[PDB]
CSV table of C-alpha atoms in Angstrom, one decimal:
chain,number,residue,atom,x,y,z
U,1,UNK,CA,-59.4,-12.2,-13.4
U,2,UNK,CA,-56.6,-9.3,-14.1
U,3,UNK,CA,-56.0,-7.4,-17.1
U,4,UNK,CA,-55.0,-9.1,-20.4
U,5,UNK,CA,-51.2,-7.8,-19.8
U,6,UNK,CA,-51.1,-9.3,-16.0
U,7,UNK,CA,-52.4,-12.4,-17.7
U,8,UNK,CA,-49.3,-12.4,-20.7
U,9,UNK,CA,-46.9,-11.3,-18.3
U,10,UNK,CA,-47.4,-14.3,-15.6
U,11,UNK,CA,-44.4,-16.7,-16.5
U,12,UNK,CA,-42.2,-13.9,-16.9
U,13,UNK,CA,-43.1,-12.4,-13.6
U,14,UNK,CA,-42.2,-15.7,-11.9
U,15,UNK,CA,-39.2,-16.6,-13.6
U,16,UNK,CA,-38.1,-12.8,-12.6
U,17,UNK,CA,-39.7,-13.2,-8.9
U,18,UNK,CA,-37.8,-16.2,-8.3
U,19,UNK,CA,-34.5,-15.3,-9.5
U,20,UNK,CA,-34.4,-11.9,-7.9
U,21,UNK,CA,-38.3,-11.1,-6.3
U,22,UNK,CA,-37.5,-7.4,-6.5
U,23,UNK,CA,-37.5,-7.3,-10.2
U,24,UNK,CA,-40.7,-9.6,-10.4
U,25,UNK,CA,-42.3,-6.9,-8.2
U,26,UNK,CA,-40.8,-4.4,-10.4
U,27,UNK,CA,-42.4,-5.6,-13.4
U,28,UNK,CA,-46.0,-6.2,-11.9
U,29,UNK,CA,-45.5,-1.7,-11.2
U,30,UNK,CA,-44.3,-1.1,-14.3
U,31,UNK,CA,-47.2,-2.9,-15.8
U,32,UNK,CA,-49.5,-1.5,-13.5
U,33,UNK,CA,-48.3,2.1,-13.7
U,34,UNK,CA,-48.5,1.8,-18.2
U,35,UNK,CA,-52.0,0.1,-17.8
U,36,UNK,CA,-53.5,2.3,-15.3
U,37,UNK,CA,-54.5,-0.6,-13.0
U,38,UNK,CA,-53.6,-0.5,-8.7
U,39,UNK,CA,-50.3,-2.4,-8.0
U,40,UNK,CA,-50.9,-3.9,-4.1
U,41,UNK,CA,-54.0,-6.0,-5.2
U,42,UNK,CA,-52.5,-7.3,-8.4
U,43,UNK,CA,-48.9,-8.0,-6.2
U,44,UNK,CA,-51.4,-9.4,-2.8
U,45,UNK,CA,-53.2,-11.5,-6.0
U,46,UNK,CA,-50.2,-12.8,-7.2
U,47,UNK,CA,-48.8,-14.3,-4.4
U,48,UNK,CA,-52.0,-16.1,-4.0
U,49,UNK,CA,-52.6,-17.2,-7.5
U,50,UNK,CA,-49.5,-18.4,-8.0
U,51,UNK,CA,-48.5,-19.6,-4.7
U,52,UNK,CA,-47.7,-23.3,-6.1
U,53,UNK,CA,-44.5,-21.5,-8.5
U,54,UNK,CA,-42.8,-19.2,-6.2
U,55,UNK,CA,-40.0,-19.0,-3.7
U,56,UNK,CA,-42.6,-18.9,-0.7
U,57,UNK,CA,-39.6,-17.6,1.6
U,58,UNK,CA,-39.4,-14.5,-0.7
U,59,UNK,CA,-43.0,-13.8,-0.6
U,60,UNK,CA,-43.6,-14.3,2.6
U,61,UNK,CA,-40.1,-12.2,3.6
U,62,UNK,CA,-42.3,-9.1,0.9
U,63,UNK,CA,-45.8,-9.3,2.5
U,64,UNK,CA,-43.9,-9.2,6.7
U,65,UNK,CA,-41.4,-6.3,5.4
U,66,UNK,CA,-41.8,-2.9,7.1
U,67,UNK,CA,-42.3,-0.6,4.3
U,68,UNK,CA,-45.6,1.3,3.1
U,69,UNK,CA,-46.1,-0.5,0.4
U,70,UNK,CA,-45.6,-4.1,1.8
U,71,UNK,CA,-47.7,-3.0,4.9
U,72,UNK,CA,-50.7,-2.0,2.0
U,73,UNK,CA,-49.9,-5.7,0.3
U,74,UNK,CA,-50.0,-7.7,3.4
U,75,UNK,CA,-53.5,-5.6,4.4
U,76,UNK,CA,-54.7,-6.8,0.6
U,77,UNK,CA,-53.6,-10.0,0.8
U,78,UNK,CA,-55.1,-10.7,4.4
U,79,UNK,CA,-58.5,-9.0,3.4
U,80,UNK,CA,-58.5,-11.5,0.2
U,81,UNK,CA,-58.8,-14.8,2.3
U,82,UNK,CA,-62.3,-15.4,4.0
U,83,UNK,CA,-62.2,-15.9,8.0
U,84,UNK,CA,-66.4,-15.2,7.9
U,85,UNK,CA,-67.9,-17.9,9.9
U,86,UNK,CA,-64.0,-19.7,10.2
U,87,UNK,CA,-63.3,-20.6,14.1
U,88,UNK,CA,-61.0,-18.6,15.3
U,89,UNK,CA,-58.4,-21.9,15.6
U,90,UNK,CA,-59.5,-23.0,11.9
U,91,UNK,CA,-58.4,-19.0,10.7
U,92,UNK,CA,-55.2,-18.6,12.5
U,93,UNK,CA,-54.1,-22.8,11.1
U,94,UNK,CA,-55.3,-21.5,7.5
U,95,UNK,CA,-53.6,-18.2,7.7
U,96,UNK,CA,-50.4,-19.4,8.9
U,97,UNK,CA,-50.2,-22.5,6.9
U,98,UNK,CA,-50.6,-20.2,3.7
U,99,UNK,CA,-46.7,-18.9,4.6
U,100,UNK,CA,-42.7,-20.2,4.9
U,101,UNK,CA,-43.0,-18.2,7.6
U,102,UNK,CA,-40.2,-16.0,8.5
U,103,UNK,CA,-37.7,-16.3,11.5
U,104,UNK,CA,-37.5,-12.6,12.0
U,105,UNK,CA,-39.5,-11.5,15.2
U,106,UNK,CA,-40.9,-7.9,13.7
U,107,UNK,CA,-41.7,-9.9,10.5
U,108,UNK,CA,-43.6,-12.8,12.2
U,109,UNK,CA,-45.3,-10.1,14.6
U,110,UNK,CA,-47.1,-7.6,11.6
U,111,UNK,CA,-48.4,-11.0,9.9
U,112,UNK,CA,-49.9,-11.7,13.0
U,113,UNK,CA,-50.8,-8.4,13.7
U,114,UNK,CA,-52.7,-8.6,9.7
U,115,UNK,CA,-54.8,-12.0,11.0
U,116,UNK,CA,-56.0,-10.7,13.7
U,117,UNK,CA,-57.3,-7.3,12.4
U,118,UNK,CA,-58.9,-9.2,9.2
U,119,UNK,CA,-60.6,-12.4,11.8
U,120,UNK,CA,-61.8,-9.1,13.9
U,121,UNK,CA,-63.5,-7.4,10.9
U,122,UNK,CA,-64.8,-10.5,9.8
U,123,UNK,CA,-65.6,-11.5,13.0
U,124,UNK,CA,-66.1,-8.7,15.6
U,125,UNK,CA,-69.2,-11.5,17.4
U,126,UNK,CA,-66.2,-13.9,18.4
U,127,UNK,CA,-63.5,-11.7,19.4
U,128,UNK,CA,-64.2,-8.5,20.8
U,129,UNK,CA,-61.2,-6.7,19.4
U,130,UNK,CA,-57.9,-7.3,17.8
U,131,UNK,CA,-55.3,-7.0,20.3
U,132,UNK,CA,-57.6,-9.3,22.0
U,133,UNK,CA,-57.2,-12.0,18.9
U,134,UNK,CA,-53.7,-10.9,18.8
U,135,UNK,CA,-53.2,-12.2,22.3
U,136,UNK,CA,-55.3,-15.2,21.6
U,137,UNK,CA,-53.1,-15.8,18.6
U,138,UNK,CA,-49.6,-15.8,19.6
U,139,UNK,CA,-51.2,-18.2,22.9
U,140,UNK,CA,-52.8,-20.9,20.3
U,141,UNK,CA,-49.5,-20.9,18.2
U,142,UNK,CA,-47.3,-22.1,21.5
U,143,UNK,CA,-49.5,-24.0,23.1
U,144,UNK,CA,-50.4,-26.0,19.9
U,145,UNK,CA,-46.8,-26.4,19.3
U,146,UNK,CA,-46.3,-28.0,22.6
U,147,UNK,CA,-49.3,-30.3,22.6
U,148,UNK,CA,-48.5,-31.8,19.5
U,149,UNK,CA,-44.7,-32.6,20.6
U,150,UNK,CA,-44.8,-35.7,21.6
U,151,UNK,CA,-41.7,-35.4,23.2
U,152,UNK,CA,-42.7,-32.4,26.3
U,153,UNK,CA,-44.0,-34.7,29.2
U,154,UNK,CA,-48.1,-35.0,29.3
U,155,UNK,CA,-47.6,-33.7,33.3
U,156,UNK,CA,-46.4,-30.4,31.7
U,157,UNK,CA,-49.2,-29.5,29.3
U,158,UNK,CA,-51.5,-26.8,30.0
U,159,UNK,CA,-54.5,-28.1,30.5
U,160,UNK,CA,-58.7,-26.4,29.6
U,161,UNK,CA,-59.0,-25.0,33.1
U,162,UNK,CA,-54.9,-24.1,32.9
U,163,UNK,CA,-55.6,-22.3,29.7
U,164,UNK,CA,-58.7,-20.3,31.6
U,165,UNK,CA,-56.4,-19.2,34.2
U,166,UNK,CA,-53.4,-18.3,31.9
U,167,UNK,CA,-56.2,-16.0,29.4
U,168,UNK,CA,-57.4,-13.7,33.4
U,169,UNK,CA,-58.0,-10.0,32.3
U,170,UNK,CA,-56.5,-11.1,28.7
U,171,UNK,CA,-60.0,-10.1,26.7
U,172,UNK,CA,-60.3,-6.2,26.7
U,173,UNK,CA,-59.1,-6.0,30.3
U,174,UNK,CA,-61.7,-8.9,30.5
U,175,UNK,CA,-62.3,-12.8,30.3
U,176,UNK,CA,-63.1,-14.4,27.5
U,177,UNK,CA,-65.8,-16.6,27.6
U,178,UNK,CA,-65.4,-20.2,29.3
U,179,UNK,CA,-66.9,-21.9,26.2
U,180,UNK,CA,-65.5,-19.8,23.9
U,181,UNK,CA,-62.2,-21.0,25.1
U,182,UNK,CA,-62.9,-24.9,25.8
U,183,UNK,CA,-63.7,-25.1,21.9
U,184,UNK,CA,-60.5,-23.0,21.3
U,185,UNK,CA,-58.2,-25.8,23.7
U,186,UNK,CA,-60.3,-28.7,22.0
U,187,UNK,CA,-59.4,-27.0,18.2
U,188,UNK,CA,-55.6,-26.5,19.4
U,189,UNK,CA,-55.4,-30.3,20.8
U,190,UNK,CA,-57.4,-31.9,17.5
U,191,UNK,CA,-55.1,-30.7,14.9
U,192,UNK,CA,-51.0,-29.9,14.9
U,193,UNK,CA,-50.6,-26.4,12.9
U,194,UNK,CA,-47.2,-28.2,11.4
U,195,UNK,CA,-46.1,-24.7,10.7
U,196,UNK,CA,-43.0,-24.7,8.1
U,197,UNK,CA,-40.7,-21.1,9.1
U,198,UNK,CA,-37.7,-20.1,6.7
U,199,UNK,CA,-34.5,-22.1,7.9
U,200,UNK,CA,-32.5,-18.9,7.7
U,201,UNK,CA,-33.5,-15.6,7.0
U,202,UNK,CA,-32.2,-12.7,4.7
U,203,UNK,CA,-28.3,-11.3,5.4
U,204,UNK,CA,-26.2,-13.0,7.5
U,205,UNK,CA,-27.3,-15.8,10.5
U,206,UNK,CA,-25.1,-17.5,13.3
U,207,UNK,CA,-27.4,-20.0,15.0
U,208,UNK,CA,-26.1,-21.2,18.5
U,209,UNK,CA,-24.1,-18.1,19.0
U,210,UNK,CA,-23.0,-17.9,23.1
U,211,UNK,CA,-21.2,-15.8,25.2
U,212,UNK,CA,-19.0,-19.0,26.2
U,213,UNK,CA,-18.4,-20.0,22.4
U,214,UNK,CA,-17.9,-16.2,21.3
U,215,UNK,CA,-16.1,-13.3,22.8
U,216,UNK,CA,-17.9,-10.4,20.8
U,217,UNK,CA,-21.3,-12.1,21.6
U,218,UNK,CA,-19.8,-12.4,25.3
U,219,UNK,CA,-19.1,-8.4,25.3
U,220,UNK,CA,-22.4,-7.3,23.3
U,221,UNK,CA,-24.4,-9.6,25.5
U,222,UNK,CA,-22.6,-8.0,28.8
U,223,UNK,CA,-24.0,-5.0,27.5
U,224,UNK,CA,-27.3,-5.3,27.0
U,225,UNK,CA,-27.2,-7.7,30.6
U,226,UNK,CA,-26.4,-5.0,32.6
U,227,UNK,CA,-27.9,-2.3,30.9
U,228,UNK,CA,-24.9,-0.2,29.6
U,229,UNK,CA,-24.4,1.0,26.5
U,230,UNK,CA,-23.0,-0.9,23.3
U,231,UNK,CA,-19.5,0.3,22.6
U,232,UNK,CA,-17.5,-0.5,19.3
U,233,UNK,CA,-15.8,-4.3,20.7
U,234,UNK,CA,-16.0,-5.2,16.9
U,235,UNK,CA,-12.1,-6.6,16.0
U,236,UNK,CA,-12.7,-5.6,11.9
U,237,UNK,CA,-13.8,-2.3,13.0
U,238,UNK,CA,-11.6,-1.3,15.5
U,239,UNK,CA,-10.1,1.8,13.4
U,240,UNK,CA,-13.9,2.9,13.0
U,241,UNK,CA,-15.4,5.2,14.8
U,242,UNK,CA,-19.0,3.9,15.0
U,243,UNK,CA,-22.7,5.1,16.7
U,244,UNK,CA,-24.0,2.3,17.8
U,245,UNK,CA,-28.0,2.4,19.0
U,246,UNK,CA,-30.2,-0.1,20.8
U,247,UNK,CA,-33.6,-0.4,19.6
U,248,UNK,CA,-35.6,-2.2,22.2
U,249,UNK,CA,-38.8,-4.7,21.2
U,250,UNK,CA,-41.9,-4.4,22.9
U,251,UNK,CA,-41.9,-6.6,25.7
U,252,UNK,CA,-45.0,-9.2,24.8
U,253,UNK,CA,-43.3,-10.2,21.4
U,254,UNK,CA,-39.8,-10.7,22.9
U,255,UNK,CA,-41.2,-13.1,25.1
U,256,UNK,CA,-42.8,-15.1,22.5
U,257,UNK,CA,-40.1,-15.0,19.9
U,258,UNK,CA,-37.0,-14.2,22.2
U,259,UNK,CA,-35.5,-10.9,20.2
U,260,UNK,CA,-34.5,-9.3,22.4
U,261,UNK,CA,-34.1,-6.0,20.2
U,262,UNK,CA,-31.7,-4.7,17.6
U,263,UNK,CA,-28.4,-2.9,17.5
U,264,UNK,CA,-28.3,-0.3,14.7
U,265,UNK,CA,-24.6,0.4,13.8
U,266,UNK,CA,-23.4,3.6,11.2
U,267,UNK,CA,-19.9,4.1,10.4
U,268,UNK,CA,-18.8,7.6,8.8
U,269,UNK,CA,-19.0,6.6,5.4
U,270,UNK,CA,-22.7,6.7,6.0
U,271,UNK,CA,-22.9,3.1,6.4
U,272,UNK,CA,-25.4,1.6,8.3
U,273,UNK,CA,-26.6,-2.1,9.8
U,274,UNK,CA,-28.7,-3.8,12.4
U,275,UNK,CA,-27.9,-6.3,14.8
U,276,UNK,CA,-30.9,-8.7,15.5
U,277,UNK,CA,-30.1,-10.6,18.6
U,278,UNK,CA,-32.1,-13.8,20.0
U,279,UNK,CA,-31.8,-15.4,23.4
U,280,UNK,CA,-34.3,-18.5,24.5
U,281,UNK,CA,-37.1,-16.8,26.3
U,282,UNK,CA,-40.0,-17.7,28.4
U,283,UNK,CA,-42.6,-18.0,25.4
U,284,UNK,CA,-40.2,-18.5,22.7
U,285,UNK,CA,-39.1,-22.3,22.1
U,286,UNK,CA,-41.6,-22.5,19.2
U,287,UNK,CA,-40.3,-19.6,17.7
U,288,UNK,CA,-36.5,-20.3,18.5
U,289,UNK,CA,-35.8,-23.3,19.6
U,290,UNK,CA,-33.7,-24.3,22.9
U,291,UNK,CA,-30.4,-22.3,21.3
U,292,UNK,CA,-29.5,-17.7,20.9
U,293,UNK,CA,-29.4,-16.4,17.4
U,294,UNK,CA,-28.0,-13.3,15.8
U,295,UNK,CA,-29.1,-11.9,12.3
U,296,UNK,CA,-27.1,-9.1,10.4
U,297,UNK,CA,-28.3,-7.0,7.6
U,298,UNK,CA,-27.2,-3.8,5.8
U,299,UNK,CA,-29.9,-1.5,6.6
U,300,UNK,CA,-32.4,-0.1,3.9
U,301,UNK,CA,-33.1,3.4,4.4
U,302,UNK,CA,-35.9,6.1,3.4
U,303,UNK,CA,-37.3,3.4,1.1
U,304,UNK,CA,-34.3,3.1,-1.0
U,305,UNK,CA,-32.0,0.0,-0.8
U,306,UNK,CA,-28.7,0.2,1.7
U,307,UNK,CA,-25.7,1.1,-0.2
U,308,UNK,CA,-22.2,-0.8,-0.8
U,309,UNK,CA,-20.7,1.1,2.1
U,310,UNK,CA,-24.1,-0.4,4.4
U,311,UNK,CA,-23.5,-4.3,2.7
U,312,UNK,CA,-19.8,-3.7,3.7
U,313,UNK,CA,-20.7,-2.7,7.3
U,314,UNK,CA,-22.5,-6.0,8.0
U,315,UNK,CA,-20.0,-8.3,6.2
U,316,UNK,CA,-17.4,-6.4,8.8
U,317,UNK,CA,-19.6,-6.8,11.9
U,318,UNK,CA,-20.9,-10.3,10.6
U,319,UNK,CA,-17.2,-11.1,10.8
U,320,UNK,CA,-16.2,-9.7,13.9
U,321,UNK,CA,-17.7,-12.8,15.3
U,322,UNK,CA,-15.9,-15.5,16.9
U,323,UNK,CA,-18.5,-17.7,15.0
U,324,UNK,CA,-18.6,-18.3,11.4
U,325,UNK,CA,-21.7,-17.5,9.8
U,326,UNK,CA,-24.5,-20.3,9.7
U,327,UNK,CA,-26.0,-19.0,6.4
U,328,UNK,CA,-25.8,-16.4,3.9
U,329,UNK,CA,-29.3,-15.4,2.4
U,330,UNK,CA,-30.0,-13.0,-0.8
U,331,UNK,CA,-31.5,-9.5,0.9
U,332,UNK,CA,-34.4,-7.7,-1.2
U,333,UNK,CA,-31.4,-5.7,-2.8
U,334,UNK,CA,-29.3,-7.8,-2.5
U,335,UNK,CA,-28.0,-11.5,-4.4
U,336,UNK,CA,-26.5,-14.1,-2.1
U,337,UNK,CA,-23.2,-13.8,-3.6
U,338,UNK,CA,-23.1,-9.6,-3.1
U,339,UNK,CA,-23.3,-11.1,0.8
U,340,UNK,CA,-21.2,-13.8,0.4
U,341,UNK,CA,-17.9,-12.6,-1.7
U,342,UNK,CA,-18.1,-9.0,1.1
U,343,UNK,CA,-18.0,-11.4,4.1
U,344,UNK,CA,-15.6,-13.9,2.2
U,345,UNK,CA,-13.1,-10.8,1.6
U,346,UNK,CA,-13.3,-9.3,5.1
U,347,UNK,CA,-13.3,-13.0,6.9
């Protein structure tokens, strides 16, 4: 149940939420902060309740954001679903299925980050912690995804005893039990997770971006190949003087998702952007597919939404590409066509 005004209020919340989903999380606060009830559970109940009428790419894009209060909905919404007496296979299928999962490494990474804290509360007798299930997790997504394509040779696919030797010293500096993982292989084999992601994600995207089809993803990659640092080789911003930044990932999730990090870019009109860029990488086909990526966004800072002069910075460096843009997708703050008419101007 919720209160008789979260009750009224649903239609309008998801005709707002779907539209723009800032303002339909605006107006679940507002109503929360004038009837004195807490705003993460009623926002982490929402998205389940009313999971069959809303842009699913939007709330799955809120509950894997990096902010406070997303990090506190996520937490609520994962603690909401019960994993007691669930297999550890049958969790991680049922949580992931619940999503349009997003194509954004940090973003997939704290959703499963939230599963495997919640299956290790729930369950601290079949995992013994939850890095451990974290490990377990991101293994079970790429291997299922594998067995299940029917087009990957059979002589490739790892194999019960293959999966034993792949999980050595995996399990709290440990193993994890032989049984314990033949019944995880036989769950992964049984069933394909047919996991649905986002086709593109918020800002701009340029799928199949290389350094022989592009020359400024020839010089940034250069860069970040031999280790050197990014200089301004941006042809829109060559009258800008620019500090450019390399944020590194951590090296497990850029194996399994291929980011290889992001470059953060400010200008001196305070404008500031980041530079996600994706190359195929050892665990990542699932994740990525056989071809690089690069996603641009203006960046939000200290909570608050970027600015014009940020939204102008990424059209700029979005179009500094050789490569048109793939896709143009609404950011929390802001609508497609903000995106669209900058990069349309500047391009």
């Amino acid at each position: 149940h919720h209160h008789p005004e979260i009750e009224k209020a649903q239609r309008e919340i998801i005709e707002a939420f779907n539209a723009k989903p800032k303002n339909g999380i605006n107006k679940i606060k507002e109503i929360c902060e004038q009837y004195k009830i807490s705003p993460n559970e009623e926002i982490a109940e929402f998205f389940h309740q009313q999971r069959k009428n809303l842009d699913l790419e939007a709330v799955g894009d809120y509950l894997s954001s990096p902010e406070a209060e997303n990090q506190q909905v996520l937490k609520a919404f994962t603690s909401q679903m019960n994993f007691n007496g669930q297999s550890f296979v049958e969790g991680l299928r049922t949580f992931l299925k619940t999503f349009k999962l997003p194509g954004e490494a940090q973003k997939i990474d704290r959703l499963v980050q939230s599963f495997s804290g919640a299956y290790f509360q729930q369950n601290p007798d079949v995992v013994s912690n939850a890095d451990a299930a974290y490990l377990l997790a991101f293994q079970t997504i790429m291997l299922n995804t594998d067995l299940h394509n029917p087009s990957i040779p059979e002589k490739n696919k790892m194999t019960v005893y293959g999966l034993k030797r792949n999980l050595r010293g995996g399990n709290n500096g440990g193993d994890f039990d032989a049984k314990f993982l033949e019944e995880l292989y036989s769950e992964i084999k049984a069933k394909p997770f047919e996991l649905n992601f986002v086709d593109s994600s918020p800002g701009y995207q340029i799928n199949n971006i290389s350094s022989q089809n592009d020359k400024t993803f020839k010089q940034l990659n250069q860069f970040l190949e031999e280790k050197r640092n990014i200089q301004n080789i941006f042809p829109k911003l060559q009258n800008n003087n620019l500090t450019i930044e390399f944020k590194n990932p951590k090296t497990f999730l850029s194996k399994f998702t291929g980011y290889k990090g992001s470059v953060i870019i400010k200008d001196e009109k305070s404008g500031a952007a980041e530079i996600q860029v994706y190359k195929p990488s050892i665990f990542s086909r699932w994740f990525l597919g056989e071809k690089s990526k690069i996603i641009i966004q203006p960046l939000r800072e200290e909570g608050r939404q970027p600015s014009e002069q940020s939204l102008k910075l990424a059209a700029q460096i979005t179009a500094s590409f050789e490569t048109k843009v793939t896709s143009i997708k609404a950011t929390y703050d802001y609508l497609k066509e903000d995106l669209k008419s900058q990069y349309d101007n500047i391009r």
